[PDB]
Design an enzyme around this catalytic site. Structure first.
Site, PDB file in Angstrom:
ATOM      1  CE  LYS A  15      -2.271  -1.063   3.695  1.00 52.49           C
ATOM      2  NZ  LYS A  15      -1.579  -2.382   3.879  1.00 52.49           N
ATOM      3  CG  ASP A 129      -4.159  -6.559   7.801  1.00 49.85           C
ATOM      4  OD1 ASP A 129      -3.675  -7.389   7.012  1.00 49.85           O
ATOM      5  OD2 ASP A 129      -3.665  -5.440   8.032  1.00 49.85           O
TER       6      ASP A 129
HETATM    7  N1  LIG Z   1       6.527  -3.562  -6.737  1.00 49.86           N
HETATM    8  C1  LIG Z   1       7.424  -3.830  -5.785  1.00 49.86           C
HETATM    9  N2  LIG Z   1       8.647  -4.338  -6.067  1.00 49.86           N
HETATM   10  C2  LIG Z   1       9.537  -4.608  -5.096  1.00 49.86           C
HETATM   11  N3  LIG Z   1       9.281  -4.404  -3.793  1.00 49.86           N
HETATM   12  C3  LIG Z   1       8.085  -3.906  -3.391  1.00 49.86           C
HETATM   13  C4  LIG Z   1       7.072  -3.585  -4.387  1.00 49.86           C
HETATM   14  N4  LIG Z   1       6.002  -3.096  -3.723  1.00 49.86           N
HETATM   15  C5  LIG Z   1       6.307  -3.119  -2.407  1.00 49.86           C
HETATM   16  N5  LIG Z   1       7.551  -3.582  -2.225  1.00 49.86           N
HETATM   17  C6  LIG Z   1       8.216  -3.755  -0.932  1.00 49.86           C
HETATM   18  O1  LIG Z   1       7.315  -4.518  -0.103  1.00 49.86           O
HETATM   19  C7  LIG Z   1       7.422  -4.059   1.256  1.00 49.86           C
HETATM   20  C8  LIG Z   1       6.049  -3.691   1.816  1.00 49.86           C
HETATM   21  O2  LIG Z   1       5.466  -2.625   1.078  1.00 49.86           O
HETATM   22  P1  LIG Z   1       4.585  -1.532   1.847  1.00 49.86           P
HETATM   23  O3  LIG Z   1       4.160  -0.596   0.754  1.00 49.86           O
HETATM   24  O4  LIG Z   1       5.353  -1.009   3.037  1.00 49.86           O
HETATM   25  O5  LIG Z   1       3.339  -2.438   2.373  1.00 49.86           O
HETATM   26  P2  LIG Z   1       2.059  -1.996   3.237  1.00 49.86           P
HETATM   27  O6  LIG Z   1       2.071  -0.486   3.259  1.00 49.86           O
HETATM   28  O7  LIG Z   1       0.933  -2.573   2.429  1.00 49.86           O
HETATM   29  O8  LIG Z   1       2.243  -2.681   4.577  1.00 49.86           O
HETATM   30  C9  LIG Z   1       8.399  -2.897   1.235  1.00 49.86           C
HETATM   31  O9  LIG Z   1       9.699  -3.335   1.649  1.00 49.86           O
HETATM   32  C10 LIG Z   1       8.555  -2.464  -0.202  1.00 49.86           C
HETATM   33  O10 LIG Z   1       9.860  -2.052  -0.546  1.00 49.86           O
HETATM   34 MG   LIG Z   2       2.141   0.902   4.821  1.00 49.52          MG
END
Ligand SMILES: Nc1ncnc2c1ncn2[C@@H]1O[C@H](COP(=O)(O)OP(=O)(O)O)[C@@H](O)[C@H]1O
Ligand SMILES: [Mg+2]
Ligand SMILES: Nc1ncnc2c1ncn2[C@@H]1O[C@H](COP(=O)(O)OP(=O)(O)O)[C@@H](O)[C@H]1O
Ligand code: SF4
Ligand code: SF4
Ligand SMILES: [Mg+2]
Lengths: 272, 272
Positions: A15, A129
């Site tokens: 996200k 979640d």
């Molecule tokens: N398209 C992508 N390619 C590589 N890594 C990604 C990609 N999208 C997200 N990530 C990685 O996945 C992890 C979680 O993403 P994040 O945006 O923090 O998730 P959320 O906000 O849904 O908990 C981070 O370490 C980010 O660098």
């Molecule tokens: Mg987040």
């Protein structure tokens, strides 16, 4: 007018990375955007601000006395492309309701006139979640009219998308909250784009974009930047620009049709 | 006596697969076990029951009138190895508190005498993305004395482990709830075991077991079974038997030492 969008999805699905990169692409286009973090992790703005994270409205209210002792300029911070950023915060684990800070933050921003006419977009980055308390408030109280769900071929990510869709249906009789699309954040598996297209069709929406898995994301985030800022020539920067274009152009906003677990399991079985 | 254990962790990390396989191995050893599902997904017992899922206490109370119209035999169902199974349920998305069913279920089970002296273990399978409401109640109300956290080298999974640990610390002045260990559910990445060992040491606990990623899990679950039942000779069955042995033998139960986000980020940077 200003478009109010919320990005929902299970934890760790992408996200905050997707939202911050999409928003950076919008600012690069000339749009004026605000990001409102609605996840207790409170790192939803760090890549725009080049920061560790951002101090939250809950934290600042506590240090200042009351939320009324805060001014909008104390809480809102501008980063890349002039994007304005704020974090809700939430109570410590085991205490209270994890979403209570979202209610405080959104009300503060509305009252303090953060929704200036010159904004083109507001994005809420919302933990998905559970859909309850403050995490339900953007849907229940008609704050984010356009919901985009980040997911992947992971069963749990698709289950979360279905659950968020059920929350949208629950409040369809009031306000204008609708599902705008699914964003597939790739696990680098075969047929994954086709799987998320099929799920979107079953819910009555569309896959707005397929975001590839690309290590340039990690290299940018280690430096506290979006890919848009870190390497504007990267293929992945063009992917986020395509996502931003399609969000801007999107006109399909629906009351979704949640599916049964049998339908979900059949999807995964079929696409192998 | 009976050991009361709770398995926490972020969504999709492997709580239900790990718990059901661990419990099947315990039953194969001759232990008497009950699983209490405390996740709204409500599929925490399906592999013991060979089922789609299980009807929840919240659902059955609603169809019966009140929870008092239910008898323990209506709710508890036995599957593989005699393992007894119950699901809490929860309100539909957008309505109420997602954890409200956990409070109803645990109180019902205590009052109805489900905690018979012949039980050796009770396992609660608890959603861990937020630690509040009914999801905090096993910690706040001293229901699960031994917490085991399923995680992986995923940043979000390690963040969740830290957040759950903060909830344990918050209630350390009452009851006896303690962190018993981390279980690494592998993403098939290099050094991952060493990374989770290092995290456990920083929190003051231990890695109780490293569970490999093995496709036999999917083949078993497509058939609604644990690996223990589906293919008792599988290497992965022996992995779950080793985990069960180490849970049985574990004597380290601590008030954990939550770490800072700088410490988490350094761990991931170091282990590359
Ligand atoms: N398209 C992508 N390619 C590589 N890594 C990604 C990609 N999208 C997200 N990530 C990685 O996945 C992890 C979680 O993403 P994040 O945006 O923090 O998730 P959320 O906000 O849904 O908990 C981070 O370490 C980010 O660098
Ligand atoms: Mg987040
Ligand atoms: N060790 C493993 N190897 C392969 N697949 C696994 C393993 N552990 C879990 N899985 C799979 O990961 C998915 C999520 O696991 P689950 O236990 O349902 O997560 P949770 O209960 O934490 O949401 C399931 O499809 C399951 O088959
Ligand atoms: S789930 Fe968090 S407080 Fe209701
Ligand atoms: S987070 Fe769910 S109701 Fe408080
Ligand atoms: Mg589960």
């Amino acid at each position: 007018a200003m478009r109010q969008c919320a990005i929902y999805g299970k934890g760790g699905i992408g996200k905050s990375t997707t939202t911050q990169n999409l928003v950076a692409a919008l600012a690069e286009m000339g749009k004026k955007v605000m990001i409102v973090g609605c996840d207790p992790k409170a790192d939803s703005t760090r890549l725009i601000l080049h920061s560790k994270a951002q101090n939250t409205i809950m934290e600042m209210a506590a240090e200042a006395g009351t939320v009324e002792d805060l001014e909008l300029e104390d809480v809102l911070k501008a980063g890349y492309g002039g994007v304005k950023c704020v974090e809700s915060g939430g109570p410590e684990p085991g205490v209270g309701c994890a979403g209570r800070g979202v209610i405080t933050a959104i009300n503060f921003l509305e009252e303090e006139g953060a929704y200036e006419d010159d904004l083109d977009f507001v994005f809420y980055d919302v933990l998905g979640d559970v859909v309850c308390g403050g995490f339900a408030m953007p849907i229940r109280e008609n704050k984010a009219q356009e919901i985009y769900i980040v997911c992947s071929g992971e069963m749990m990510a698709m289950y979360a998308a279905n659950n968020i869709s059920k929350g949208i249906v629950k409040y369809a009789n009031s306000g204008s909250v609708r599902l705008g699309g699914l964003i597939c954040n790739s696990r680098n598996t075969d047929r994954e784009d086709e799987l998320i297209i099929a799920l979107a069709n079953k819910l009555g929406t569309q896959m707005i974009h397929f975001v590839p898995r690309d290590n340039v994301v990690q290299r940018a985030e280690i430096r506290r930047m979006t890919v848009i800022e870190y390497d504007p020539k990267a293929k992945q920067a063009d992917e986020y620009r395509a996502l931003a274009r399609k969000v801007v152009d999107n006109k399909l906003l629906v009351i979704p049709n949640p599916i049964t677990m049998d339908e979900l399991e059949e999807l995964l079985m079929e696409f192998g």
